[PDB]
């Protein structure tokens with residue numbers, strides 16, 4: 001869907017920005033600093049899970065650029081591993097949100113965050 | 126969800142960028158220059174309809190900035206009108222995609238695009 005590789009970089013960056021907002025805005029709720037409204041969280045996690053699937057298709061062949069490390073493309077198997085692991089962690093967060101369980105939401109949220117950081121430490125400049 | 130107003134501007138810009146990609150990438154299919162795979166379009170329109178709901182909440186009070194015209198906030202009723210009209214047009218596009226009907230997809234896609242342009246001509250610098 002990208003006319004030039006830069007278009008793919010801007011796309012991915014925009015997706016990750018939105019993930020990020022939808023992930024991070026739940027921090028105060030996981031920490032108990034904001035109230036827990038199960039329905040509000042369920043609906044937000046449903047936005048996050050749609051968004052969480054989007055960045056990956058925008059690291060296709062020849063879309064080197066941005067703050068992506070080249071290793072994304074020389075170590076493709078490892079990178080697909082780490083995105084699929086992240087997405088699997090999002091499934092667990094969606095299950096927790098769907099159950100309306102603040103303890104399981106907290107644990108799941110931490111799992112997800114560790115998966116963001118694990119990818120970044122290997123693949124983000 | 127925004128620590129400062131700039132965070133809201135970057136969010137909205139990122140959302141609109143992603144709408145945009147998910148909208149525009151269907152142009153060749155509406156024009157017949159790429160093949161029509163009903164399932165592929167149905168799934169893409171489902172991403173677009175989630176994305177299409179996101180920018181509006183990031184033009185809250187005091188989030189002036191970006192390429193947003195001030196009229197967004199002095200003419201709030203008009204702006205909510207134009208976003209709700211746009212979203213209603215997205216409903217019609219989702220119905221067309223769900224029906225697997227290329228004629229209705231084409232008409233709906235044009236409706237949607239006119240709603241993007243109508244907002245921009247009033248509210249985007």
Ligand code: HEC
Nearest residue numbers: 013016017019020023066067068082083086116119123124
């Ligand atoms: C888990 C929820 C997250 C969160 C909150 C973010 N990411 Fe990542 N990310 C990855 C790479 C390769 C990039 C560089 C992309 C590029 O510049 O080309 C990034 C970038 C980001 C950003 C910055 C986006 C920007 O606006 O420029 C942010 C906000 C961000 N990430 C948040 C790689 C990955 C992963 C590899 C499998 C995974 C998993 C994540 N990121 C997860 C998350």
Ligand code: HEC
Nearest residue numbers: 138141142144145148191192193207208211241244248249
């Ligand atoms: C219909 C599908 C679309 C499409 C393809 C886009 N928009 Fe708009 N838009 C609106 C305003 C006020 C802004 C300025 C936002 C800001 O800078 O603060 C924009 C911006 C955009 C962009 C640029 C984003 C960027 O990366 O900076 C693009 C790509 C874009 N739009 C595409 C206002 C509206 C509407 C008001 C109700 C509606 C409807 C749309 N936009 C619709 C669409």
